[PDB]
Design an enzyme around this catalytic site. Structure first.
Site, PDB file in Angstrom:
ATOM      1  N   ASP A  63       0.831  -1.196   0.000  1.00 47.18           N
ATOM      2  CA  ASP A  63       0.000   0.000   0.000  1.00 47.18           C
ATOM      3  C   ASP A  63       0.869   1.250   0.000  1.00 47.18           C
ATOM      4  OD1 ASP A  63      -2.941   0.364   0.026  1.00 47.18           O
ATOM      5  OD2 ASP A  63      -2.523   1.667   1.740  1.00 47.18           O
TER       6      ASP A  63
ATOM      7  N   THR B   9      -3.969   4.804  -4.117  1.00 44.27           N
ATOM      8  CA  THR B   9      -3.067   5.645  -3.340  1.00 44.27           C
ATOM      9  C   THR B   9      -1.726   5.834  -4.036  1.00 44.27           C
ATOM     10  OG1 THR B   9      -4.127   4.650  -1.411  1.00 44.27           O
ATOM     11  CG2 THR B   9      -2.242   6.073  -1.040  1.00 44.27           C
ATOM     12  N   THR B  10      -1.235   4.805  -4.724  1.00 43.64           N
ATOM     13  CA  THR B  10       0.007   4.943  -5.477  1.00 43.64           C
ATOM     14  C   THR B  10      -0.206   5.750  -6.750  1.00 43.64           C
ATOM     15  OG1 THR B  10       0.562   2.744  -4.636  1.00 43.64           O
ATOM     16  CG2 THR B  10       1.990   3.673  -6.328  1.00 43.64           C
TER      17      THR B  10
ATOM     18  N   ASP C 211      -8.554  -2.599   1.583  1.00 45.51           N
ATOM     19  CA  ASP C 211      -8.619  -1.988   0.258  1.00 45.51           C
ATOM     20  C   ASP C 211      -9.771  -2.570  -0.555  1.00 45.51           C
ATOM     21  OD1 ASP C 211      -6.519  -0.267   0.697  1.00 45.51           O
ATOM     22  OD2 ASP C 211      -5.387  -0.901  -1.072  1.00 45.51           O
TER      23      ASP C 211
HETATM   24  N1  LIG Z   1      -5.995  -7.796 -13.538  1.00 42.21           N
HETATM   25  C1  LIG Z   1      -5.475  -6.626 -13.978  1.00 42.21           C
HETATM   26  N2  LIG Z   1      -5.057  -6.482 -15.253  1.00 42.21           N
HETATM   27  C2  LIG Z   1      -4.540  -5.326 -15.702  1.00 42.21           C
HETATM   28  N3  LIG Z   1      -4.394  -4.230 -14.938  1.00 42.21           N
HETATM   29  C3  LIG Z   1      -4.774  -4.233 -13.641  1.00 42.21           C
HETATM   30  C4  LIG Z   1      -5.348  -5.460 -13.076  1.00 42.21           C
HETATM   31  N4  LIG Z   1      -5.630  -5.194 -11.788  1.00 42.21           N
HETATM   32  C5  LIG Z   1      -5.269  -3.908 -11.549  1.00 42.21           C
HETATM   33  N5  LIG Z   1      -4.755  -3.341 -12.652  1.00 42.21           N
HETATM   34  C6  LIG Z   1      -4.262  -1.951 -12.767  1.00 42.21           C
HETATM   35  O1  LIG Z   1      -3.123  -1.744 -11.936  1.00 42.21           O
HETATM   36  C7  LIG Z   1      -3.129  -0.391 -11.485  1.00 42.21           C
HETATM   37  C8  LIG Z   1      -2.448  -0.264 -10.132  1.00 42.21           C
HETATM   38  O2  LIG Z   1      -3.276  -0.747  -9.081  1.00 42.21           O
HETATM   39  P1  LIG Z   1      -2.665  -0.777  -7.596  1.00 42.21           P
HETATM   40  O3  LIG Z   1      -1.408   0.052  -7.617  1.00 42.21           O
HETATM   41  O4  LIG Z   1      -2.581  -2.198  -7.100  1.00 42.21           O
HETATM   42  O5  LIG Z   1      -3.769   0.023  -6.748  1.00 42.21           O
HETATM   43  P2  LIG Z   1      -3.348   1.307  -5.878  1.00 42.21           P
HETATM   44  O6  LIG Z   1      -3.083   2.369  -6.915  1.00 42.21           O
HETATM   45  O7  LIG Z   1      -4.557   1.552  -5.016  1.00 42.21           O
HETATM   46  O8  LIG Z   1      -2.130   0.867  -5.108  1.00 42.21           O
HETATM   47  C9  LIG Z   1      -4.580   0.048 -11.455  1.00 42.21           C
HETATM   48  O9  LIG Z   1      -4.705   1.340 -12.047  1.00 42.21           O
HETATM   49  C10 LIG Z   1      -5.321  -0.972 -12.295  1.00 42.21           C
HETATM   50  O10 LIG Z   1      -5.928  -0.323 -13.412  1.00 42.21           O
HETATM   51 MG   LIG Z   2      -5.166  -0.765  -5.468  1.00 45.58          MG
END
Ligand SMILES: Nc1ncnc2c1ncn2[C@@H]1O[C@H](COP(=O)(O)OP(=O)(O)O)[C@@H](O)[C@H]1O
Ligand SMILES: [Mg+2]
Ligand SMILES: Nc1ncnc2c1ncn2[C@@H]1O[C@H](COP(=O)(O)OP(=O)(O)O)[C@@H](O)[C@H]1O
Ligand SMILES: Nc1ncnc2c1ncn2[C@@H]1O[C@H](COP(=O)(O)OP(=O)(O)O)[C@@H](O)[C@H]1O
Ligand SMILES: [Mg+2]
Ligand SMILES: [Mg+2]
Ligand SMILES: [Mg+2]
Ligand SMILES: [Mg+2]
Lengths: 98, 528, 155, 113, 532, 528
Positions: free
Chosen positions: E54, E87-88, E391
């Site tokens: 996170d 958040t990232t 989350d």
């Molecule tokens: N199964 C998937 N296939 C392709 N892209 C994905 C998948 N799951 C999440 N993503 C993309 O990865 C990006 C980063 O998500 P993540 O960094 O885990 O969430 P956060 O930004 O809350 O930490 C998101 O913008 C999402 O669009």
């Molecule tokens: Mg996420």
């Protein structure tokens, strides 16, 4: 391959991708790595090319020797097998000339 | 990481690898470029750097500023190295090379951050550089007439363009005429040591003069020198490498006598040796005597009695310039002082120049050498004047080698950027982005000119791009009018080799910086 | 506004470019020019009291305690123990005036200080210093021509 | 400081007490780091210093004199208790599962209406 | 001249310093983006270990000194508070926006023009997202919530077990549904108690159809299981009575002392007797219970729990229908306890979980509650499980509240980049450049996603941009707006069909917050650092 | 002082890349190698020196790992894994660490190539599911009513410990303790070895005299010599409240004005004590046990009824006595009931062991708690014996809760590895290589057993693999004492399915958790 900026103990900058030069400028302290560097420098002196080949081949050989020692083989058996395979490789090599 | 009881490399070895280290290298190159960024163009400024001892150097030359900085970053040292290389090969454009190299690296930084392979970037740089050099050679303007008046005008225009960024830019026409006059007298090798440069404190810049001959400062006259005449109307000059004073005949010589008569004979023999040398010099007809070796008081008084001029301990370069100006030969022995080894000049005179006496050899019709006498209000003033004159002299020499010119003020680079963009529009697309980035980075110099001059760079760049797209090769930046103009018709001329070498060196530096992926620093030895 | 720049990289790795960069100061842009004008103005205002028949002297002591009482501007500036580079420039200007002419070594410093003082208020209004220098050169040419015009010849 | 007798026994006692007294903030520092006088380092080195609210409430120096060299956590615990500086022992769960939540907002189930 | 006891940085120096700080903060967490991102393991100065993916947790645990970096960290915290996801992404977007804005400013573009262009670009991006890229969840059914949970839990420690964890999350969120005034359903997340216990594998984590208490019975003599529980929730301690500060006991006749001392405990005895006489089986109190009252409960054959957390007690009371009582005082001035104050549950059990015991209140009536017990290999893994679970719960709550979702995998960023690059040409002359830079900076998300997978970021982003340009230009190719990134195979993919969804609120709030933070940092051109 | 501009703190250290993954994997490998030699029937013990001055002599993995302080967070994770395995099932602590190390090694092999960690993690999870399925497939049931088979299971659990010499005695003690502490109330079954089934170790004597008591033994003596130290069929009453006059909660100052009030107050204190004692006596008990103090006057009044009193007993000990003798602890003596009196303890006796008095209640009919009296050479020997008995009791409880049984001696490892290898032949993807690698990583248990036995690892392991390639050889393992292949349905070494499932799950999830980390940040303040 990519060049490496190596600064030795005299603040002299080396920009090269030559393995022998990189090893020469690096201050290697471990005796076994020193021995491998000696082998690479000997290859450089004898032929002038193939030092990186020597280094990577020795590294792979030692890694796989560690694996063989872990699975139960002895040092003598590994050494004997390596020597036999080296003789086989030197026998095969003349046939590979194109 | 694990302790590894016996470590591979010795303690203190620092290693940086991957994308972050190359991004750091690009940032360091950006810092180095910014260190000299403001000193470009007719509206450029000077930088003052104080060393450890406390002496300050004031300069507009990029190579000098970069040398004075104690740059220790391995990647940032490449910009200093290419600046030195440009100074050595060409002599002008030492700021443009650094600006272009850093702009190339800055433009390709985003593609580095996204994981593009550096080999692709290097290949694109090499292709773009080859195309740009070929385009420069193709569109450079040359005249196949060999007209003396036209060649003189071209040299003067190039010299003024090279000079219109320094503190002497107000007298740029006068100094450029001096420089072109000086260079045109060198015979075939255009040796820099044949153009003496003397700096004398006091006087205005317009008071500086070019001597059609040789001039050098007075060199520790002995007693009886003031009894010698200080002006000759057709003197024969004896150029010697001889010590004219009473001294031991040899360092290992020993005299053994056992009679007072022999003692007196030895004393008289020493005096007779000295007087024989002096008489041989005098009988040659020469009225001015110059020596690389000391001339004693006895010889000075002897020459004063004969109404002759003497000057010992003359520097070797000054003697060589005097020989080239007059037409004699430096003689290590006075036994054969024939007329073939005596220099000739129309007028010799010792005059006062700002609290310093100087010897003047003028009227030489066959002289192959010159001597600048620069006047200023401070040591750094005259040093920077000498640096600017050196830039102009190198430019004029290169133009003498070949009279191929391109319009300055960024016009050539805007044309190159347009050509490279047009080429990049017709390739698959992986190289297209990189060649477009190269073309965009080529726009730094006109933008930097506008920024230094205080304009709005964006509007000027837009107007230049529109003009180049619709035709017009030589439209650059008009600094005085805050607009764009045909820089070729405005006589903002540069030798083509300047931009050719600038592009080549900047591309090579960018490729070398990009090609490095790991930096290893061994611990310092003998820190003391 | 000093020490140069310090970023230590956007990755946390060391960022060392110039030797002893943490012990080196740096002035840039208009601030450096303002400081230079201030130093030159201080020197010129110090010297301007020693101008004319009613001008006063300066009693100068060297590092060995020897006392020199003088009105000559070149001597005062040469013996003055300065550290600022612009002050050294003014000292060299006085020395050059003494070398070329031998008299007027105090007028040059006062004139330069006044010129820089006017250039300060010119810069405050947004004029490039190169433009100010060009205007100064033009006015100096005009003044020199006028001096030639209004001069008189003596026997 | 390293090598002086009683330091390791004190370290073990502090480890045990910190195990039994989470509230207290047991810590150690070398005399060289604090820049103590050479006399204090040579003669009065093993010393337990107790603080409370930025002011001294315990001024124990040369604790080996009244504790010896083989003192255990029991000895130090009793010795601190008998001056009433050690906070009273509070019974707590030895080990359990973790929750790790603290109020916040909208952390409220609400009846549907 | 100023004579200020401090350091002053002005202009390009301070602008570059702020951009460097923001870029460093971004680069810290850029490696933890997308399903191919990897976790970070942080160690305190006291040896405490935290393994997390996170961004908010990383930026909170980090000790930061630069003010712009602090601004970015607080931006991440605010995004976590107001949305719970992305958040990232918000930090990365804000840093890229600041970097591009500074690049524009270095070209003598005035910062006010850049700020105006950024505001216009943000407004138009929000409008375009709301009008073109949203998908109504009404036609998708329950599978939309599962897909959103799966997308949220990718890149987390529970990503591979998503098939199980998404069902768990959806059931937990649906178990706490309620409708407030105006008939709008609400999903009070943080009402789902999460208990972490190392032990069995992840797949054996339990979703409790009720509530889970991190507490045990007061005395070993009490039963550990009650079938038909009548829960009584109290907000007062059950100890020996003590008079207040204003009341004093003075004895002149000695014969009264024994009666005083007897009543001193008979008061609490009578209170407990009333509470037990109403029929209660389980007694939960926020205060303590001493041995005598514990023995009363033991003899009554009832379960008594002490030192129950206030939030846990409130949740249990409202789930079971009980009423919190801070005193047994009625409106008649008497001391009574009524059966109407008793909550009910189908079972109350103290079960063993890895050599430790906790209390489960199963199937509370008049309201459904949910609790989750996470099983992991050790404490750090359970902590990361809890963060990822939170989350996912927040993502599902956002999806259920606002019934619009957007495709994931960088499809939204590419579509916005293309649209804003097209739209910039119709606004101003320098705000045109600002909007173009906004559009270009929006592409940092798919670029980082592709980089994390060691894929060809340039080629994949070019293909995505070509697909979205074809979608925007051609009128019958509107189905290409869902083309995102498939990081497993490194190819573009229709993410709407693949089930890669995000709540629209995540993207909208991230855009707005990043734009505001970038504007705030860009507003600085001079720093005075007073000496402490 | 001097102010360096910084983003993070000075003491913040960050490292990332392949170095972090390699460091984590080598840390796990080192943790495994620490206890590699403590597995098997021929394991060697280790001496651990406490920071508090104690000595731990054991071959249990959890104690060895918990006694080691480490700096690398991966090693901390491994130690936490060891503690989790110990707390969950109580056995397999050494095996799980070795399995995790081997899995991380075979993962590092792939991470050296260009395979992303997420692919390895997905393959690992698929493999873990398949291992669980195979383990459930090859398991066999046990009859809990068969005492011989339960004793055999406990023996095979304790054959690897120092207590294996007295195998029958230890097995009988563990089985009897677990069986009698087993409880059922309100439809909820429980074992609760932690609270009841207390182990008390008294140094001295012989270990053959160790036994499980039919009741509870405590280190207490009667409050006064006139108490009876031997009661045939005692009726026991347990209390928490003190039997002495104590201050009230409220401030209750008295004010004495009359002469006799002081003596009256003292007389009523005595009368209150007498009333409490009479309320206790009304139930006609023989023994009174209190968790708090008993006044001397209370002792006298209890003697008048011929009642033995013991005071200052720990709460856990009092609960154990309540479970053993079937009593209920009562706080207020006036609320004593007949069913609160503990009848069922068939003997109470205070006897002297060494130079100390110990209270024995060791003839209970159907006791639900017990004291395991351990006598031995010294304190460390008895501590190791207690640890071994704890392992045996945990294994017995695991079998009682889950009657599934799994072959030991590495047979289950080889069977699961062969099944997974056969299953991997029909996937034809990129995940097949990590799947097969982590499948074959289970062979580290038979290899470790052979290495510890001192036999030839390569030949024996190859023979075992070839045997397991056959059609019914799932129960073929290695004899850890002779270094020969043997069928485990003949050797008799069997283990609970719960222990194996927990070991595999914990090892695979440890590998998964440590494979997800590429960045390490350390040194920051705790901030709280
Ligand atoms: N199964 C998937 N296939 C392709 N892209 C994905 C998948 N799951 C999440 N993503 C993309 O990865 C990006 C980063 O998500 P993540 O960094 O885990 O969430 P956060 O930004 O809350 O930490 C998101 O913008 C999402 O669009
Ligand atoms: Mg996420
Ligand atoms: N009169 C002029 N008008 C416009 N541009 C000029 C003029 N003179 C020189 N320049 C430009 O200034 C640039 C820098 O020249 P200069 O500062 O003299 O040396 P360097 O190339 O080493 O910086 C050149 O590229 C040239 O095109
Ligand atoms: N007589 C035996 N022959 C071969 N293997 C045995 C024998 N007894 C026990 N083992 C093996 O030794 C392992 C137990 O080792 P142990 O020291 O208890 O480690 P752990 O505490 O991790 O279980 C079991 O997996 C079992 O298969
Ligand atoms: Mg080669
Ligand atoms: Mg130039
Ligand atoms: Mg005068
Ligand atoms: Mg075991």
């Amino acid at each position: 391959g990519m060049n490496k900026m190596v600064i030795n103990h005299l603040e002299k900058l080396f920009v090269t991708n030559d393995a022998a030069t990189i090893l020469r400028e690096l201050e290697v302290q471990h005796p076994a790595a020193k021995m491998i560097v000696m082998a690479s420098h000997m290859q450089e002196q004898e032929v002038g090319d193939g030092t990186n080949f020597v280094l990577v081949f020795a590294g792979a050989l030692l890694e796989l020797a560690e694996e063989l020692l872990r699975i139960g083989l002895s040092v003598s058996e590994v050494i004997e097998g390596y020597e036999i395979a080296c003789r086989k490789a030197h026998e095969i090599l003349p046939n590979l000339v194109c | 990481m694990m302790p590894t009881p016996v470590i591979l490399l010795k303690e203190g070895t620092d290693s940086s690898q991957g994308i972050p280290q190359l991004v750091s290298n690009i940032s360091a190159c950006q810092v180095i470029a910014e260190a000299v960024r403001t000193t470009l163009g007719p509206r450029g400024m000077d930088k003052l750097i104080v060393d450890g001892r406390g002496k300050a150097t004031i300069s507009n030359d990029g190579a000098t500023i970069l040398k004075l900085l104690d740059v220790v970053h391995p990647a940032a040292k490449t910009l200093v190295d290419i600046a030195k290389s440009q100074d050595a090969e060409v002599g002008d454009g030492t700021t443009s090379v650094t600006l272009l190299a850093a702009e190339f690296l800055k433009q390709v930084k985003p593609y580095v951050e996204e994981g593009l392979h550096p080999q692709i970037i290097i290949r694109a740089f090499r292709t773009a550089t080859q195309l740009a050099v070929n385009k420069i050679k193709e569109i450079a303007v040359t005249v196949k007439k060999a007209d003396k008046v036209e060649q003189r005008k071209l040299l003067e225009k190039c010299a003024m363009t090279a000079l219109s960024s320094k503190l002497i830019s107000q007298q740029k026409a006068f100094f450029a005429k001096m420089v072109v006059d000086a260079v045109m007298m060198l015979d075939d090798l255009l040796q820099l040591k044949m153009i003496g440069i003397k700096k004398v404190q006091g006087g205005a810049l317009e008071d500086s003069q070019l001597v059609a001959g040789v001039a050098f400062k007075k060199t520790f006259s002995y007693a009886g020198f003031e009894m010698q005449p200080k002006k000759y109307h057709n003197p024969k000059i004896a150029l010697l490498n001889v010590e004219l004073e009473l001294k031991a005949e040899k360092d290992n010589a020993e005299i053994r006598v056992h009679t007072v008569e022999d003692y007196q004979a030895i004393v008289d023999a020493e005096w007779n040796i000295l007087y024989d040398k002096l008489e041989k010099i005098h009988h040659s007809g020469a009225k001015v005597v110059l020596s690389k070796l000391p001339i004693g008081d006895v010889a000075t008084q002897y020459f004063a009695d004969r109404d002759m001029f003497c000057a010992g301990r003359v520097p070797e370069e000054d003697l060589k310039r005097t020989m080239m100006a007059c037409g004699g030969s430096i003689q290590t022995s006075v036994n054969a002082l024939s007329a073939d080894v005596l220099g000739r000049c129309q007028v010799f005179e010792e005059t006062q120049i700002g609290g310093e006496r100087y010897n003047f050899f003028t009227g030489c019709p066959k002289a192959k050498t010159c001597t600048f006498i620069l006047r200023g209000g401070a040591e750094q003033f005259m040093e920077e004047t000498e640096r600017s004159l050196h830039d102009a002299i190198m430019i004029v020499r290169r133009a003498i080698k070949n009279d191929s010119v391109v319009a300055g003020g960024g016009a050539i680079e805007m044309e190159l950027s347009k050509y490279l963009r047009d080429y990049s529009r017709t390739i698959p697309g992986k190289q297209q982005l990189l060649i477009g980035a190269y073309a965009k980075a080529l726009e730094i110099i006109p933008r930097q000119l506008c920024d230094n001059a205080g304009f709005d760079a964006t509007n000027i760049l837009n107007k230049l791009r529109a003009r180049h797209a619709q035709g017009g090769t030589w439209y650059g930046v008009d600094i005085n009018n805050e607009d764009i103009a045909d820089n070729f018709e405005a006589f903002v001329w540069e030798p083509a080799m300047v931009r050719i070498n600038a592009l080549t060196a900047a591309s090579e530096a960018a490729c070398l910086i990009v090609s490095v992926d790991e930096t290893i620093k061994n611990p310092r030895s003998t820190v003391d | 506004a000093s020490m140069g720049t310090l970023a230590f990289d956007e990755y946390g790795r060391p960022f060392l470019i110039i030797k002893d960069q943490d012990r080196k100061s740096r002035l840039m842009g208009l601030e450096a020019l303002k400081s230079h004008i201030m130093a030159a103005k201080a020197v010129a205002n110090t010297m301007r009291t020693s101008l004319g028949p009613n001008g006063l002297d300066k009693m100068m002591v060297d590092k060995d305690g020897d006392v020199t009482v003088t009105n000559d501007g070149a001597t005062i500036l040469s013996m003055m123990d300065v550290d600022h580079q612009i002050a050294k420039l003014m000292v060299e200007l006085s020395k050059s005036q003494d070398d070329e002419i031998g008299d007027g070594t105090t007028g040059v410093v006062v004139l330069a200080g006044a010129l820089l003082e006017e250039a300060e208020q010119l810069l405050d209004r947004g004029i490039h210093p190169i433009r100010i220098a060009d205007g100064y050169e033009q006015a100096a040419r005009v003044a020199i021509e006028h001096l030639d015009k209004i001069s008189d010849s003596v026997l | 400081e390293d090598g002086i007798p009683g330091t390791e026994a004190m370290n073990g006692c502090m480890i045990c007490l910190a195990a039994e007294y989470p509230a207290v903030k047991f810590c150690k520092v070398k005399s060289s780091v604090i820049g103590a006088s050479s006399q204090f380092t040579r003669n009065a080195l093993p010393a337990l210093l107790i603080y409370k609210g930025g002011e001294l409430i315990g001024n124990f120096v040369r604790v080996t004199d009244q504790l010896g060299d083989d003192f255990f956590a029991v000895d130090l615990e009793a010795f601190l208790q008998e001056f009433g500086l050690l906070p009273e022992k509070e019974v707590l769960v030895l080990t359990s599962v973790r929750n790790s939540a603290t109020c916040h907002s909208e952390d409220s189930d609400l009846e549907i209406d | 001249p100023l004579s200020v006891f401090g350091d002053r940085s002005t202009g390009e120096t301070i602008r570059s310093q702020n951009v460097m700080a923001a870029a460093s903060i971004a680069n810290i967490v850029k490696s933890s983006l997308g399903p191919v991102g990897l976790d970070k393991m942080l160690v305190d100065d006291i040896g405490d270990v935290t393994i997390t993916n996170d961004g908010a947790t990383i930026l909170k645990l980090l000790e930061v000194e630069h003010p712009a970096a602090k601004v970015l960290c607080e931006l991440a915290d605010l995004q976590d508070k107001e949305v719970g996801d992305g958040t990232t992404s918000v930090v990365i977007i804000a840093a890229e926006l600041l970097k591009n804005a500074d690049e524009l400013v270095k070209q003598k573009i005035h910062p006010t023009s850049v700020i105006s262009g950024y505001r216009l670009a943000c407004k138009e991006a929000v409008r375009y997202i709301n009008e073109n890229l949203i998908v109504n969840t009404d036609e998708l059914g329950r599978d939309c919530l599962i897909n959103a949970a799966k997308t949220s839990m990718s890149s987390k420690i529970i990503g591979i077990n998503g098939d199980f964890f998404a069902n768990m999350v959806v059931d937990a969120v649906l178990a706490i549904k309620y409708t407030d005034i105006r008939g709008q359903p609400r999903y009070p997340v943080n009402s789902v108690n999460i208990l972490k216990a190392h032990g069995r594998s992840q797949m054996e984590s339990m979703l409790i159809s009720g509530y889970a208490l991190n507490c045990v019975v007061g005395s070993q003599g009490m039963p550990k299981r009650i079938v038909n529980a009548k829960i009584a929730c109290l907000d007062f301690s059950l100890q020996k009575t003590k008079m207040k500060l204003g009341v004093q006991v003075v004895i002149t006749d000695p014969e009264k002392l024994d009666q005083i001392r007897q009543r001193e405990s008979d008061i609490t005895k009578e209170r407990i007797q009333k509470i037990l006489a109403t029929g209660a089986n389980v007694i939960l109190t926020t205060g303590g219970i001493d041995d005598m009252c514990l023995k009363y409960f033991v003899e009554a054959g009832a379960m008594a729990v002490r030192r129950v957390l206030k939030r846990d007690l409130k949740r249990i009371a409202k789930a079971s229908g009980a009423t919190i009582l801070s005193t047994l005082a009625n409106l008649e001035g008497e001391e009574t306890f009524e059966a109407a104050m008793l909550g009910q549950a189908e079972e109350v059990v103290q079960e063993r979980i890895c050599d430790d015991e906790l209390i489960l209140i199963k199937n509370t009536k008049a309201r459904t509650s949910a609790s989750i017990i996470l099983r992991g290999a050790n404490d750090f893994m359970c902590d990361e499980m809890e963060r990822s679970l939170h989350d996912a719960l927040c993502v599902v709550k956002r999806v259920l509240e606002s019934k619009s979702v957007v495709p994931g995998g960088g499809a939204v960023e590419a579509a916005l980049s293309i649209y804003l690059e097209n739209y910039a040409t119709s606004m101003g002359s320098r705000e045109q450049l600002a909007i173009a830079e906004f559009a270009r900076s929006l592409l940092v998300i798919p670029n980082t996603l592709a980089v994390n997978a060691a894929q060809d970021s340039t080629d994949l982003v070019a293909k995505l941009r070509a697909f979205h340009n074809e979608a925007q230009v051609n009128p019958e190719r509107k189905n290409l707006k869902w083309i995102g990134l498939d990081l497993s195979n490194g190819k573009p993919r229709d993410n709407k069909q693949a089930g890669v969804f995000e709540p629209t609120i995540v993207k909208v709030k991230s855009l707005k917050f990043a734009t505001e933070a970038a504007i705030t940092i860009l507003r600085i051109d001079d720093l005075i650092k007073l000496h402490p | 002082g001097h102010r360096p501009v910084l983003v993070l703190s000075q003491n913040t250290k960050r490292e990332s890349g392949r170095k972090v993954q390699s460091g984590n994997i080598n840390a796990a490998k080192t943790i495994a190698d620490i206890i590699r030699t403590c597995l098997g029937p021929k394991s060697m013990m280790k001496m651990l020196l406490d920071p508090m001055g104690g000595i731990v002599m054991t071959n249990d993995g959890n104690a060895i790992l918990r006694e080691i302080q480490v700096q690398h967070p991966a090693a901390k994770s491994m130690i936490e894994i060891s503690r989790t395995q110990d707390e969950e099932v109580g056995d397999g602590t050494t095996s799980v660490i070795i399995l995790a190390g081997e899995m991380l090694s075979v993962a590092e092999h792939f991470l050296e190539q260009q395979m992303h960690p997420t692919v390895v993690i997905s393959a690992y999870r698929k493999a873990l599911d398949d291992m669980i399925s195979t383990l459930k497939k090859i398991s066999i049931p046990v009859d809990i009513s068969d005492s011989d088979m339960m004793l055999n299971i406990i023996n095979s659990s304790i054959t690897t410990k120092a207590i294996s010499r007295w195998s029958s005695l230890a097995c009988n003690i563990a089985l009897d303790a677990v069986k009698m502490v087993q409880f059922e109330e309100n439809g909820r079954k429980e074992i609760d070895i932690k609270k009841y089934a207390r182990v008390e170790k008294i140094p001295g004597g012989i270990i053959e005299d160790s036994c499980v008591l039919r009741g509870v033994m405590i280190n207490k003596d009667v409050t006064h010599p006139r108490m009876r130290r031997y009661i045939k069929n005692p009726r026991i009453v347990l209390l928490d409240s003190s039997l002495e006059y104590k201050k009230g909660e409220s401030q209750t100052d008295i004010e004495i004005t009359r002469e006799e009030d002081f003596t009256r107050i003292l007389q009523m204190e005595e009368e209150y004590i007498q009333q409490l004692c009479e309320d206790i006596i009304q139930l006609k008990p023989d023994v009174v046990i209190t968790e708090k103090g008993i006044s001397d006057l209370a002792q006298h009044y209890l003697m008048r009824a011929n009642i033995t009193a013991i005071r200052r007993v720990r709460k856990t000990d009092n609960n154990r006595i309540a479970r053993a003798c079937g009593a209920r602890i009562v706080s207020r003596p006036e609320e004593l009931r007949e069913d609160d009196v503990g009848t069922g303890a068939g003997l109470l006796e205070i006897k002297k062991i060494g130079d100390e008095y110990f209270t024995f209640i060791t003839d209970c009919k159907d006791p639900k708690a017990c004291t395991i009296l351990l006598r031995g050479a010294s304190k460390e020997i008895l501590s190791e014996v207690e640890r071994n008995l704890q392992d045996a009791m945990q294994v017995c409880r695991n079998v009682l809760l889950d009657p599934q049984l799994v072959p030991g001696g590495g047979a289950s490892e080889m069977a699961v590895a062969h099944a997974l290898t056969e299953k991997s032949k029909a996937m034809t993807g990129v995940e097949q290589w990590p799947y097969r690698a982590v499948a074959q990583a289970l062979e580290v248990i038979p290899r470790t057993l052979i290495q510890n036995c001192g036999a030839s690892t390569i030949r024996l392991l190859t023979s075992l693999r070839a045997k397991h390639t056959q059609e019914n050889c799932e129960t073929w393992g290695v004899n850890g004492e002779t270094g020969t292949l043997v069928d485990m349905k003949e050797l008799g070494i069997w283990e609970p399915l719960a222990v194996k499932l927990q070991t595999y799950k914990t090892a695979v999830e440890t590998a998964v958790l440590l494979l997800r980390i590429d960045d390490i940040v350390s040194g920051h303040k705790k901030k709280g």
